[PDB]
Amino acid sequence: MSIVVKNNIHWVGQRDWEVRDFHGTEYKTLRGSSYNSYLIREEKNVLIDTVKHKFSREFVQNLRNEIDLADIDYIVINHAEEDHAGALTELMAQIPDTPIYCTANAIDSINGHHHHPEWNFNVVKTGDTLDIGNGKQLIFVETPMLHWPDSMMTYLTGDAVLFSNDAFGQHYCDEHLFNDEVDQTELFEQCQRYYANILTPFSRLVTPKITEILGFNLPVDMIATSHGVVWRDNPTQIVELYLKWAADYQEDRITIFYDTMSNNTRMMADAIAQGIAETDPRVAVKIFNVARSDKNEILTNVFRSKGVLVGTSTMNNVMMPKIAGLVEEMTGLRFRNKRASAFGSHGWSGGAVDRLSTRLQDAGFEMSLSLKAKWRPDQDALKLCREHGREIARQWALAPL
Amino acid sequence: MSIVVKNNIHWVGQRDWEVRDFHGTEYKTLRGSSYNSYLIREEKNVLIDTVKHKFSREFVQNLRNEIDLADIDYIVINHAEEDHAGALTELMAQIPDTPIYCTANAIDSINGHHHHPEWNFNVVKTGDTLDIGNGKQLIFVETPMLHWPDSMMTYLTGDAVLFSNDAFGQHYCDEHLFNDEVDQTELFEQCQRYYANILTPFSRLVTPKITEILGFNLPVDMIATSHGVVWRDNPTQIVELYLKWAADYQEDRITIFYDTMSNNTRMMADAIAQGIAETDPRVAVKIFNVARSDKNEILTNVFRSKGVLVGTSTMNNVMMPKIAGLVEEMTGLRFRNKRASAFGSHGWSGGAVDRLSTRLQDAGFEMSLSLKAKWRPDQDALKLCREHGREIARQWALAPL
Ligand SMILES: Cc1cc2nc3c(=O)[nH]c(=O)nc-3n(C[C@H](O)[C@H](O)[C@H](O)COP(=O)(O)O)c2cc1C
Ligand SMILES: Cc1cc2nc3c(=O)[nH]c(=O)nc-3n(C[C@H](O)[C@H](O)[C@H](O)COP(=O)(O)O)c2cc1C
Ligand SMILES: [Fe+3]
Ligand SMILES: [Fe+3]
Ligand SMILES: [Fe+3]
Ligand SMILES: [Fe+3]
Ligand SMILES: [O]
Ligand SMILES: [O]
């Protein structure tokens, strides 16, 4: 069935236990996800978002079991990405005259995917209202570039429920709907994973938008996102997390990742970490081989880290491709207030370390000196690598000693 | 046992049926590989190369079954990469006084990995000889940057066997040793795969070196490489292939590869291919999703192609990382006389296509106009994509019409 969220609000979405790949293969969902759609039944009946196109047949059928499709008065699209607006064409094929409430940018994104401009769109902007009867109304808030130009939130008065869509959501699949009914650790991990890999480049927009919403003085009993749990128990805890994460978040932590062909760079990475740990016991150190690790776990650690060390060997005068790929993605995520140091081994002329050091600088990292070694590091070379870690640990110390 | 190659030449190497990853994960060996070592037993006993460090215990033990280690007079190292010189430390621990014949650059690479400079190295250069008795001698030929600075070949007179190490070799595992005893198709595929992914950036050096060797007027009955089969039946067929491949090789072929998040770029790629195929029936077209395909198969096709089309969506104002990674590797391989065109879909401001087009130009490709589309291509947009393929097909035509 559907699931009662609160009063006349029904969850009519779809759980996805199997899904492992989002945005191509750029976001690994190791704990699946959910696509949350909501049906509000007052004097007016309002559908908020749909689900992935994959589950369009199930969505419409399940919706029929809950309500006659002709009885649906309004459709609200907070965000026109395929995982929320994917079943729209299938639904609108049954109820073509049904009005769609969304942002001006959403008309471009909806039509961009579905190619049905003849649909009855209603442009909404911040402050706009939609009465649904019984003294209740929907209030719309534009949230451009969080994370799309078309993005917005919908607030329901009386019930005090914020339909935040992607915001404050996470890719975490569970039979239980509410945040207080799931594993808190797995919940936090997926929440932080989501922000770090998706919302980091828009952090400068997060705080003013949240500040703007708080200025509306709207009571919040529940936050119903488009992914994962519904926040009902201390729902603002995820909002406070977003405030902390947005402020160029960093812990006393250093992330080391690299790619290697014959483990020479790996030997350097381990020696560097040893140097750090024996210089500053406060620092948490994580090491990843990018060819053998979870890319999104690496990026989440980078997000949590005060600085990173990136390693690569020289291959055909350039750096290893997986490193080049990862640095490119970091260049998009725009990490702030973080430092970096490039290292790696070479055979003769090298050049990849300097190349990498430049690209990290291009990614926005404050660069420290690079570390280079020839072939396999002997005991003398490993001392230099260990000393490099000492150099980094002292330079990047948050506090003296 | 060992296997008799010819007369007193014995193969004492190692077959690797399981291996799937070389140079980290940069070269996928889908048909395994072999590490060919050779023992020549005349008046003098000569070991040519060893095997991967992984199989050091087996190598030394198998060598003991064939000969007393103390009876080994000379050790020849053509190339000090781990898959040929890996078992050296283990071997030299038993026979430390045994002379090692190699290039001057090899002393740096051998010591770089093994850290035993006390070994008795003998620097050899092109033209140098080593008598082994019975009217036979070894002739050394320096082949720097083919594919390493330390690389060389060893020629055995009388038996007329060229120990070419990496050159003319391939990653192909079989119980049969000779080229005329294996599947010719699988053999050609691995040979071309090897050259395309490894020896392409050194193509300018291949022809003069082969020309230089041919000037020595040395008869060739067999070519014993360090990987895969021993060429005994028309052994120069692989040499002629190398001559063709080195001359900026290209067929009437176009390779299309891309990465996508919601299949918009994929739709463009398919429409482009359709446009090409209906414009020039001579052109062979291959399409790959880089996130779902064999990276080395893509690079082999690029090598065979007269031109490529590369697709990417815009993700956080930059291109998709796997595309960025692949272009970086292509920048190292230095393909020549090839053309390229960037394409892809975007949501609002885009920018990834122009970014990609520039990097392909940096990789050495002659750039044609880019193709851009917003969101999912409708029928009108797909016509433009189909027309783009027509534009490419006509521009890149080897012959009129
Ligand atoms: C395919 C390949 C290409 C290489 N290209 C270069 C190069 O262009 N310049 C250089 O100095 N060394 C080059 N090398 C040597 C490596 O950089 C050297 O072995 C390095 O110490 C190994 O680093 P790693 O084991 O951490 O991957 C190359 C090695 C391989 C296998
Ligand atoms: C995570 C993410 C980031 C995006 N970033 C941008 C961007 O920076 N600029 C832009 O114009 N579109 C951006 N888009 C929109 C996509 O480029 C758009 O959906 C495109 O048409 C999809 O291409 P594809 O399906 O071939 O992957 C982004 C989309 C996603 C999911
Ligand atoms: Fe989204
Ligand atoms: Fe979403
Ligand atoms: Fe090699
Ligand atoms: Fe090799
Ligand atoms: O989304
Ligand atoms: O090699």
Phi, psi of A62 (to 5 degrees): -65, -35
Establish if A293 touches chain B: CB-CB under 8 angstroms. Answer: no
Cβ-contact A283, A252 below 8 angstroms:
yes
Instruction: Tell me which amino acid residue B10 is.
Output: H
CA distance B291 to A198: 19
Q: Compute chain B's Rg from CA coordinates.
A: 24
B145 vs A: CB within 8 A: no
- Decide if B32 contacts B251 (C-beta within 8 A): no
Q: What is the resolution of this structure in A?
A: 2.0
Alpha helices (H) in A165-309, listed in sequence order: 184-194, 203-214, 237-246, 264-277, 295-304
Exposure string over A267-304, b if 16+ CB within 10 A, otherwise e: bbbbbbbbbbeebbeebebbbbbbbeeebbbbbbbbbb
Please name the residue that has the structure tokens 């081994």: A345
Q: Which residues in B159-290 belong to E strands, given as ranges? A: 161-165, 222-225, 230-231, 253-259, 284-289
Helix, strand, coil % in chain A, rounded to nearest 5: 35, 25, 40
Tokens matching residue A26: 């750029």
Q: A372: which 2 tokens?
A: 């280079």
Determined by X-ray
- Euclidean distance between CA atoms A49 and A178, whole angstroms: 19
Residue A206: both structure tokens together = 């997060």
Looking at CA atoms only, how far is residue B109 from chain A in angstroms? 7
Residue B36 has a CB neighbour count (10 Å cut-off) of 26
Amino acid at the residue A220: V
**In the beta sheet, which residues pair with residue B2?**
none
Distances (CA, A) of A59 to A1, A35, A62, A79: 11, 10, 5, 17
For residue B233, CA distances in Å to B37, B167, B180, B182, B184 come to: 20, 17, 6, 12, 12
| Chain centroid offset of residue B62 CA | 29
* Distance (Å, whole) CA B220 – CA B234: 9
Q: Is A62 exposed, middle or buried (0-12, 13-18, 19+ CB in 10 A)?
A: middle
| Catalytic residue set of A | 23, 79, 81, 83, 147, 166, 194, 227
The answer to whether B85 is annotated as binding is no
Strand pairing of B121-123 and B100-102?
parallel
Q: How far is it, in rounded angstroms, from Cα B318 to Cα A28?
A: 20
Counting ligands in written order, the one closest to the CA of A312 is 1
Instruction: Check if the beta carbon of residue B305 is closer than 8 Å to that of residue B333.
Output: no
CA distance A119 to A69: 16
Residues of A in contact with B109 (CB under 8 A): 347, 375
- Which residues neighbour B275 within 8 Å (Cβ) at sequence distance 6 or greater? B385, B386, B387, B388, B389, B390, B391, B392, B393
B53 touching A (Cβ < 8 Å): no
